[PDB]
Amino acid sequence: QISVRGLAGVENVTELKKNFNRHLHFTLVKDRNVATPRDYYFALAHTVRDHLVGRWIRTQQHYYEKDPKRIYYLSLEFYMGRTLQNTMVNLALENACDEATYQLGLDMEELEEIEEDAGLGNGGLGRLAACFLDSMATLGLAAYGYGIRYEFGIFNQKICGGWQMEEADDWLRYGNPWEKARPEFTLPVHFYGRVEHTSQGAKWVDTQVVLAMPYDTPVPGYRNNVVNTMRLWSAKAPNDGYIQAVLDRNLAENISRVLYPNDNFFEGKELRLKQEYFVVAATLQDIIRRFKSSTNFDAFPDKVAIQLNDTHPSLAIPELMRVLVDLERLDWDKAWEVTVKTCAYTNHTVLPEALERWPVHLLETLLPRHLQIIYEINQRFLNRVAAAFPGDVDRLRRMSLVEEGAVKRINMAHLCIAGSHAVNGVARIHSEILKKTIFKDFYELEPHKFQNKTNGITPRRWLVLCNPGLAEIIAERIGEEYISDLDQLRKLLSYVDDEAFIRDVAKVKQENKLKFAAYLEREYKVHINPNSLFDVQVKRIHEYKRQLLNCLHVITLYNRIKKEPNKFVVPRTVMIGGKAAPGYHMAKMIIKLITAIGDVVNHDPVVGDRLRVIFLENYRVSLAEKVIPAADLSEQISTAGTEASGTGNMKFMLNGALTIGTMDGANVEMAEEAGEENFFIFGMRVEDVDRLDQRGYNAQEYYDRIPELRQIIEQLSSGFFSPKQPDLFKDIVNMLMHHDRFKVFADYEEYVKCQERVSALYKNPREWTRMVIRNIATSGKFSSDRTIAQYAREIWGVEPSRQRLPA
Amino acid sequence: QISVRGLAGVENVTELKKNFNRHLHFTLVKDRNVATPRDYYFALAHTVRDHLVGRWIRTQQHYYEKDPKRIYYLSLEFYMGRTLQNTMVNLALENACDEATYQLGLDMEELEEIEEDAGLGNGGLGRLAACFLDSMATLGLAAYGYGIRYEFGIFNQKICGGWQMEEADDWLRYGNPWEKARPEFTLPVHFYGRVEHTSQGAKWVDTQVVLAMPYDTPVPGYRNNVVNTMRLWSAKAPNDGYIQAVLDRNLAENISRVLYPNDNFFEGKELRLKQEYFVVAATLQDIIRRFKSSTNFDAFPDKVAIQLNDTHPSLAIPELMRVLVDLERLDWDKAWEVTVKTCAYTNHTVLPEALERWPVHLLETLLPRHLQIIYEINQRFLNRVAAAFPGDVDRLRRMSLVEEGAVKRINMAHLCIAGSHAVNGVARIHSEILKKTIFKDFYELEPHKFQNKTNGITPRRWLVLCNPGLAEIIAERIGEEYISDLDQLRKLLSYVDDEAFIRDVAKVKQENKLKFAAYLEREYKVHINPNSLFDVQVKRIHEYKRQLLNCLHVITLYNRIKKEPNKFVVPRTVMIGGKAAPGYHMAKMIIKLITAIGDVVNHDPVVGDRLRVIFLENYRVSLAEKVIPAADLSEQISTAGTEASGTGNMKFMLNGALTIGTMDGANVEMAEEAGEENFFIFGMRVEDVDRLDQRGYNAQEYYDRIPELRQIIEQLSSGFFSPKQPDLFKDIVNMLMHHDRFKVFADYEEYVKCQERVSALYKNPREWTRMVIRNIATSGKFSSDRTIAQYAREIWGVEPSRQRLPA
Ligand SMILES: CC(C)c1ccc(C[C@@H](C)C(=O)N[C@@H]2O[C@H](CO)[C@@H](O)[C@H](O)[C@H]2O)cc1
Ligand SMILES: CC(C)c1ccc(C[C@@H](C)C(=O)N[C@@H]2O[C@H](CO)[C@@H](O)[C@H](O)[C@H]2O)cc1
């Protein structure tokens, strides 16, 4: 039906139909008279999967013959979403399958909705890893993603009486057709035990053994016939009264059971540390085996790069040393040189409560040999510091990997900097913050280590797949090359005064809004005006992301309507969605507040359909793919200095929403690419936040001088939004008035004023749409293809390639 | 190569080859350069499985159209063994696959050895269920086997220093290609809670819910294109801090984790009771759904038969009542009539420690509604007893389902008799014992309930599959019809004087012995003389089976050799194998004793190769298929009255071994079919055992009057067989001398004398072989096809059929 979705060849359509029927009969063991839609989904999935494996086998064959340098991307999270549609898009099969399924009497979009998300991540860090795998395949790199095959991913969120309820995400219940178990590559991982010293060096003995069993998932590049591998490890007990011993096998297997859903506060939990070591130990053995099967580890850094996605896999550093020193008998200095040249570390946050600092006593018990290696690393590192800055004893204690105090801890970030040849932040302002504040000492010691790599998103999933209409009208004007070369979108600047294009952009958006408005009614039974401005804030719930500031704006609009009901205001649907970490009480209160505001606002006859507040339940990748194409306004309103980058921001920009935000994370580079006049910038800069901290932030001052703000706080305290429990929101008021680390009141006035400028522009459709074109046209820098090309050239030492492999 | 293995059509061989390559590439995601033998096995398994599913789908379709009466065979155990070869045999594909694999450069027999046993049973009861499924499919009955998909089957046995060690049988580790998960048919099962009474009857409330997820395995009949289903239930937690709640899901799922390996002593363990209820509750819901999808339960007994394999699924009785009364609102009397006409019960033992007697307090807590129904059943039953035998108060207490004492218990056998229209034993003498002793009261009340159904074995697995040589030379003379009509083997009586046949029988046996002798050396590195008589005792280790009596004979032979070294004796390899229940201390000592005797005997230069004693490790179905065709002598030496039937006995008879045994279980009918002169019968009959019990068994008497016996006991006590721990076997000596329930010494003299007659015959090959022919020729009655035809006609009310379904 549309051109970007590929050819529907008669031969191809015929072949797909017969393979579909083959799988329905032989794979699913069903016939057309009892098959459910779920069965039809699976028969299609298996049909599409068959087209991967030929390319999968020859890609891996190709890497064996050519032996290029291999990139190993280590992460505890891969937030993959659904695979079926992505795979069709990258193989150019979407229209053929559509035709083929239509001819069998089935609607393919209906079948697409049956697939579970692979929710093996929390948010931005996990989704970044998923975008990166896609870009790495698309750019022909010999790359492997390594992680854990969690049995339960991020919880499903239900809202019950306005409160978040968690329920287990049993995503493997019906099977996963994309994975292939590889039990023949099972590897042992050790825990506990103790260290013996001998003439022949140290030995780690009396250990408990857990098996790591790999499951491989294919990762197709965009129309280049490259298919890379994501290898995820599952935990299994070794095979050595009787009944209880068999039931106690569950204790080993609990390692890979569940994704840890805490994305705000570091907790020293043993089970988490076991997960970290497990993925690291199995991956490194696998890496080494692959390297040997092509004595001399001098060439290891020329054949292997290991990228550490935050500190979560930081134990790769002492594990590589353990293997090289204890098992392969390299001398310390040589092993260290190999380790540093092999490893690189990416930081994804500056909030101090988020840094991993493991208690020594845990490491002592679980990984006694690793603690020894860490102490040794620390001592040799601090000797280099002492020699470069003689007499600076304060620097020595600040830079130590060991932190003293009540409990001693290892700082995993310091470990990563010491053992890596490159350290990067994830947007320019974040990388500067790293150098100027929390890693300043390390930057002064080794300035050459520190780099920037601004994040990106894949334009396959985040434009072609989720917004086919937009991709199509773009392709009409400029062709299809932009999909793997997103800088070509600049060519759209020459259509900013073209009346037909202006009309098509606006129509795509409007169709997206109608489609989403319908979805809301169908799956969640309430109605919205699709002529309103769709004001959208979607991301995990955190105080730093300031969903509360949005809440304050919403109540301001409501109060202004009640004050002058018969005055005209631009109507709005305000949508906020996202999950809260289960232990994070304040985040859970914020969700309740949002639903509570909705309860009042949505049932006020005087408001009518001019203002609606919806909490979008169970935000996840599949829901992002629906709501982001329907958005007019993107809320990116974190306190300056707190959002390392953001990636949702880039998704909205690519899909035709305008952005209101602070000068934080990648927003800065986004406004720079589009021009500041085409972005709704407000609020304190990083410099202003600092000045406010020097002085002391006093929230009472703002309450005293802004009557509209005072009125909101009084409504909150008095029970206006919680009539049956007047004090429900006292924790929120109290935090805002006395304990607000993120200075919500300080940006309130400028935010509200900036929101008025948004409303003004929306009244003039033609000029709104013209500003949108200018955003879409300049969004090219934010392709993860750009990001990965920079990692490849400046960190990994490999050259990307856009050349096809033979089909 | 041989005729019974089917045609190797050029078309067929070509097709198998291409499908083999298809699965290797698309299913296993491998190429010929990295494939292991395990991969080749799987590609063949998937190739063969594809030929099942067409027939599977149309068989189940056929039953839907025709709606015959359905047979539901409920068992906690299905001891299936390997599936690949069985499936080829029943589909007539064995020679085609052999050819096809040979042409690909592979040896099919090598690939067959890679398959894991499905060891979902302990022994005779579990293997009987497996033979029965095969016969039911072969006879065209609409039959389903229902059980539990245990994650761990019967343990693997290792012998370490002569002691049994158990290790977990992780049989699903590499996947199971024969099963199909059916998550869409998942059903809820309830536990705990409490009973509320209302105007509208009883309600069972506040229950914990476990999900039952079915996995279907195909069961092919012999060359009739019928494919029945074995449905095995797996336990899953429902989807409703956070981390711990997710990890606690394992508690629900433990229900289906492990096969209970105790086959000697009843233990009231809650987890076992949960397994019993779980299989029962999910199966009954499934049965009812199937019945409704064709109000009126009057026709339920005309459409449904439920066979209870021992008392293990006895809760089907009160569960069917619960469903009919509480949920469908039938009145008690009508529901009871339906239940009795639907259910039938098979007893598989008379040892009192083996009967299930659950403590009331367990039922009270776990299944409070079921206890109520059981009390009500009991009261109405005992009113019928009182009315038939007025004033017989002693009868009332003997027949009660409730047993009083320290702890009150429910007798599950009494429950089964009360709620079933038929009760059967499993060999004629066993069924008579039921009527005369432990169920005498019940027989006097309802004599029409009591039947016999003598056990059998499937001649597909137990002749064609495991002894192709023998099957072939038989087919040369009499054709192939015998394979599904085993009575035709009688025609072989006319070849008992045929010199060529005599020679072929003896050659098959000899080739089987050489093949097995080789296997021993290869997988278990020690050597045996293949010209010796292979004296074999294989079965679970129990005191009643009297492996100890065999041990006493072996030591007698050894002592006679040492006394007269230069005298001639018929050389023997004595093989004993089997597993012991983990908690059964005496059985574990017997295994140690056997290995200990081996240690002395096998390293005595004076003995040479005239006597060897091997303990066959890890006896299981796949090992049975190897050792039984190689046997000359079958040891079936249980104390008269204790082995309900035996089935191993029948396997040996079919495969050309002579039997030495007591007049116990099916041995009685075997000797009757072959003629007593063609069987080595010795020992007390049931009547003699009784007389001895009246008098009092005093083992000292035998020790005092038999010098050879005294010498053995002295060797045992003094440490002859355990030099470094002289008292190791004091428990054994003490049991034999003072506490022997099974009267080992009482049969010693007659056993030893009977063993001399065996040796005498073996010296005359021609006459040995002539006796063998007479056994094989009369083994037809012991086909499970005969057994199942009798269940069908006399219990289930359905007619078997040998007619093909269309291919
Ligand atoms: C529990 C603790 C160890 C922990 C704290 C915080 C997090 C969340 C961090 C790692 C995260 O997701 N950071 C995000 O990374 C994205 C990809 O670089 C950025 O776009 C985003 O700005 C940043 O917050 C995970 C674990
Ligand atoms: C733990 C207790 C409940 C229990 C005791 C004994 C057993 C073993 C019984 C049930 C068994 O296997 N019996 C065998 O059944 C075979 C098939 O009918 C007979 O051939 C054999 O004689 C009999 O012992 C299982 C569980």
Chain B residue numbers with beta carbons less than 8 Å from the beta carbon of A31 are: 57, 61
Under 8 Å CB-to-CB from A540, ≥6 apart: which residues? Answer: A122, A123, A124, A263, A578, A579, A580, A581
Return the H-helix or E-strand segment holding A346.
Answer: strand A343-346
* Angle between helices B37-66 and B10-22 in degrees, nearest 10: 110
In the block, which residue shows the tokens 């649907």?
A573
Q: In a 3-state reduction of DSSP, which class is residue A348? A: coil
Looking only at the bridges linking them, the beta strands covering A208-220 and A227-236 are antiparallel
Angstrom distance (rounded) from CA B518 to CA B428: 40
Angstrom distance (rounded) from CA B210 to CA B225: 37
Task: Cite the DSSP H helix spans in A628-727.
Answer: 648-654, 667-674, 686-695, 699-705, 707-718
A73 Rama sector, left if φ>0, alpha if ψ -120 to 50, beta otherwise: beta
Say if the Cβ atoms of B54 and A25 lie within 8 Å.
yes
* Residue B644 alpha carbon to ligand 2 centre in Å: 8
Angstrom distance (rounded) from CA A472 to CA A483: 11
φ/ψ (deg, to 5) at A766: -65, -40
Angstrom distance (rounded) from CA B157 to CA B169: 9
B664 Rama sector, left if φ>0, alpha if ψ -120 to 50, beta otherwise: beta
Copy the structure tokens of residue A307: 């990228």
The radius of gyration computed from the CA coordinates of chain A, to the nearest angstrom, equals 27
Measured between alpha carbons, how far is residue B256 from residues B7, B120, B250 in Å? 42, 11, 11
Rounded to 5°, the CA angle A469-A473-A476 comes to: 140
Task: Tell me whether residue B738 is one of the annotated catalytic residues.
Answer: no
Angstrom distance (rounded) from CA B267 to CA B142: 35
Rounded to 5°, the CA angle B655-B661-B666 comes to: 70
Angstrom distance (rounded) from CA A649 to CA A755: 17
Nearest to A416 by CA among A401, A426, A435: A401
Return the H-helix or E-strand segment holding A336.
Answer: helix A332-342
Say if the Cβ atoms of A53 and B29 lie within 8 Å.
yes
Task: Answer positive or negative: Cα dihedral of A311, A317, A322, A328.
Answer: positive
Q: Residue A167 forms beta bridges with which residues?
A: A156
Nearest to B61 by CA among A76, A635, A31, A481: A31
User: How many CB atoms sit inside 10 A of residue B375's CB?
Assistant: 14
Nearest to B23 by CA among B118, B107, B100: B100
The answer to whether B686 and B640 are in contact (CB under 8 A) is yes
Under 8 Å CB-to-CB from B777, ≥6 apart: which residues? Answer: B489, B490, B491, B492, B493, B496
DSSP code for B117: P
Nearest to A142 by CA among A87, A92, A73: A73
Task: Tell me whether residue B348 is one of the annotated catalytic residues.
Answer: yes
The answer to whether B666 and B649 are in contact (CB under 8 A) is yes
Out of A357, A370, A460, A539, pick the active-site residue.
Answer: A539
Domain B1-456+784-807: which topology?
Rossmann fold (3.40.50)
Angstrom distance (rounded) from CA B213 to CA B709: 57
Copy the structure tokens of residue B57: 């789908």
Under 8 Å CB-to-CB from A33, ≥6 apart: which residues? Answer: none
Copy the structure tokens of residue A659: 């952005």
User: How many CB atoms sit inside 10 A of residue A282's CB?
Assistant: 26
Closest-CA residue of B relative to A28 is: B180
The radius of gyration computed from the CA coordinates of chain B, to the nearest angstrom, equals 27
Q: Residue B195 forms beta bridges with which residues?
A: B204
Q: Residue A205 forms beta bridges with which residues?
A: A194
Angstrom distance (rounded) from CA B634 to CA B776: 13
Angstrom distance (rounded) from CA A736 to CA B331: 66
Return the H-helix or E-strand segment holding B681.
Answer: strand B680-681
Experimental approach: X-ray
Copy the structure tokens of residue A110: 């209906």
Angstrom distance (rounded) from CA A226 to CA A804: 8
Distance, first Cα to last Cα, chain A: 25
Does any ligand 2 atom lie closer than 6 A to the CB of residue B99? no
* Residue B643 alpha carbon to ligand 2 centre in Å: 9
Task: Tell me whether residue B540 is one of the annotated catalytic residues.
Answer: yes
Task: Answer positive or negative: Cα dihedral of B695, B699, B704, B707.
Answer: positive
Task: Answer positive or negative: Cα dihedral of A605, A609, A610, A614.
Answer: positive
Q: How many residues does chain A have?
A: 807
Q: Pick from A166, A243, A257: which is nearest to B247 by CB?
A: A257
Task: Cite the DSSP H helix spans in B352-491.
Answer: 360-366, 368-388, 393-399, 412-418, 428-436, 440-445, 459, 468-478
Half-sphere exposure at residue B668, Cβ-oriented, CA atoms within 13 angstroms: 24
φ/ψ (deg, to 5) at B734: -65, -45
Distance between alpha carbon B540 and the CA centroid of its chain, in Å? Answer: 10
Q: Residue B616 forms beta bridges with which residues?
A: B577
In the block, which residue shows the tokens 């129990």?
B542
Under 8 Å CB-to-CB from A189, ≥6 apart: which residues? Answer: A209, A210, A211, A212, A277, A278, A281, A282
HEC-encoded secondary structure of B711-765: HHHHHHHHCCCCCCCCCCCHHHHHHHHHCCCCCCHHHHHHHHHHHHHHHHHHCCH
Copy the structure tokens of residue A651: 């998704």
Half-sphere exposure at residue A249, Cβ-oriented, CA atoms within 13 angstroms: 22
Quickly list DSSP for B104-116.
Answer: TT--HHHHHTTSP
Distance from CA of A18 to the nearest CA of B (A): 15
Angstrom distance (rounded) from CA B101 to CA B92: 16
Q: Pick from B26, B242, B271: which is nearest to A261 by CB?
A: B242
Nearest to B453 by CA among B799, B789, B802, B80: B789
Out of A369, A453, A545, A743, pick the active-site residue.
Answer: A545
* Residue A122 alpha carbon to ligand 1 centre in Å: 9
Q: What is the residue extent of each domain of chain A?
A: 1-456+784-807, 457-783
Copy the structure tokens of residue A400: 């130590």
Angstrom distance (rounded) from CA A548 to CA A729: 12
Give the best residue of B26, B42, B253 to mutate against chain A (max A CB count within 10 A).
B26
Half-sphere exposure at residue A71, Cβ-oriented, CA atoms within 13 angstroms: 29
Quickly list DSSP for A621-646.
Answer: HHHHHHHGGG-SEEEE-PPTTS-S--
Give the best residue of B42, B116, B246 to mutate against chain A (max A CB count within 10 A).
B246
Long-range pairs of A748-754 with CB within 8 A, sequence gap ≥ 24: A748/A549, A748/A552, A748/A702, A748/A706, A748/A709, A749/A706, A750/A682, A750/A683, A751/A549, A751/A552, A751/A553, A751/A637, A751/A682, A751/A683, A752/A553, A752/A556, A752/A708, A753/A682, A754/A660, A754/A680, A754/A681, A754/A682
Copy the structure tokens of residue A669: 């580079």
φ/ψ (deg, to 5) at B599: -55, -40
Distance between alpha carbon B795 and the CA centroid of its chain, in Å? Answer: 21
φ/ψ (deg, to 5) at B312: -60, -35
Q: In a 3-state reduction of DSSP, which class is residue A146? A: strand
Under 8 Å CB-to-CB from B413, ≥6 apart: which residues? Answer: B311, B314, B347, B355, B356, B439
Half-sphere exposure at residue B469, Cβ-oriented, CA atoms within 13 angstroms: 18
Distance, first Cα to last Cα, chain B: 25
The answer to whether B616 and B598 are in contact (CB under 8 A) is no
For residue A612, the one-letter residue type is: R
DSSP code for B464: I
Question: Measuring from each residue's beta carbon to the nearest atom of ligand 1, which residues come in under 6 Å?
Answer: A 123-125, 128, 262-264, 266, 310, 348-349, 354, 356, 426, 455, 643-647, 665
Distance between alpha carbon B181 and the CA centroid of its chain, in Å? Answer: 25
Nearest to A303 by CA among A287, A316, A284: A287
User: How many CB atoms sit inside 10 A of residue B298's CB?
Assistant: 11
Exposed, middle or buried by CB within 10 Å (0-12, 13-18, 19+), for B578? Answer: buried
DSSP code for B258: B
Exposed, middle or buried by CB within 10 Å (0-12, 13-18, 19+), for B800? Answer: middle
Angstrom distance (rounded) from CA B80 to CA B117: 7
Angstrom distance (rounded) from CA B162 to CA B222: 42
Half-sphere exposure at residue B625, Cβ-oriented, CA atoms within 13 angstroms: 23
Annotated binding site of B for AMP: 31, 64, 289-294
Angstrom distance (rounded) from CA A306 to CA A315: 12
Chain A residue numbers with beta carbons less than 8 Å from the beta carbon of B582 are: 241-242
Nearest to B287 by CA among B151, B191, B179, B144: B144
Q: Residue A146 forms beta bridges with which residues?
A: A74, A231
Angstrom distance (rounded) from CA A595 to CA A551: 10
Nearest to B498 by CA among B478, B513, B516, B517: B478
In the block, which residue shows the tokens 């069965």?
A39
Half-sphere exposure at residue B624, Cβ-oriented, CA atoms within 13 angstroms: 29
Angstrom distance (rounded) from CA A634 to CA A651: 10
Angstrom distance (rounded) from CA B204 to CA B191: 10
Looking only at the bridges linking them, the beta strands covering B194-198 and B201-205 are antiparallel
Under 8 Å CB-to-CB from A677, ≥6 apart: which residues? Answer: none
Long-range pairs of B13-18 with CB within 8 A, sequence gap ≥ 24: B13/B96, B13/B99, B13/B100, B13/B103, B16/B47, B16/B93, B16/B96, B16/B97, B16/B100, B17/B100, B17/B103, B17/B104
Return the H-helix or E-strand segment holding A230.
Answer: strand A227-236
Classify domain A457-783 by CATH architecture.
3-Layer(aba) Sandwich (3.40)
User: How many CB atoms sit inside 10 A of residue A463's CB?
Assistant: 26
Under 8 Å CB-to-CB from A696, ≥6 apart: which residues? Answer: none
Nearest to B474 by CA among B127, B3, B19: B3
User: How many CB atoms sit inside 10 A of residue A522's CB?
Assistant: 8
Angstrom distance (rounded) from CA B96 to CA B462: 22
Copy the structure tokens of residue B91: 């589909």
Angstrom distance (rounded) from CA A447 to CA A435: 9
For residue B125, the one-letter residue type is: L
Out of B339, B642, B647, B778, pick the active-site residue.
Answer: B647
The answer to whether B358 and B336 are in contact (CB under 8 A) is no
Under 8 Å CB-to-CB from B765, ≥6 apart: which residues? Answer: B506
Angstrom distance (rounded) from CA B548 to CA B533: 20
Per DSSP (E only), the strands in B450-587 are 450-452, 533-538, 572-577
Nearest to B542 by CA among B357, B710, B728, B354: B354
Angstrom distance (rounded) from CA A215 to CA A230: 8
User: How many CB atoms sit inside 10 A of residue A783's CB?
Assistant: 29
Q: How many residues does chain B have?
A: 807
Angstrom distance (rounded) from CA A80 to CA A625: 12
User: How many CB atoms sit inside 10 A of residue B491's CB?
Assistant: 16
Characterize A747-757 residue by residue with b for buried, 16 or more Cβ atoms within 10 angstroms of its Cβ, and e for exposed.
bbbebbebbee
Angstrom distance (rounded) from CA A263 to CA A123: 8
Chain B residue numbers with beta carbons less than 8 Å from the beta carbon of A53 are: 25-26, 29
φ/ψ (deg, to 5) at B275: -65, -45
Nearest to B416 by CA among B347, B361, B369: B347
Judge whether B1-456+784-807 and B457-783 match in fold: yes
DSSP code for A407: S
Q: In a 3-state reduction of DSSP, which class is residue B2? A: coil
B20 Rama sector, left if φ>0, alpha if ψ -120 to 50, beta otherwise: alpha
Nearest to A571 by CA among A533, A604, A544, A542: A533
DSSP code for B330: -
Angstrom distance (rounded) from CA B424 to CA B434: 9
Q: In a 3-state reduction of DSSP, which class is residue A155? A: coil
Q: Give resolution, Å, one decimal.
A: 2.2
Max distance between CA atoms of chain B, in angstroms, equals 90
Quickly list DSSP for A89-138.
Answer: HHHT-HHHHHHHHHHTT--HHHHHTTSPPEEE--SHHHHHHHHHHHHHHH
Distance between alpha carbon B239 and the CA centroid of its chain, in Å? Answer: 37
Nearest to B114 by CA among B101, B129, B130, B133: B101
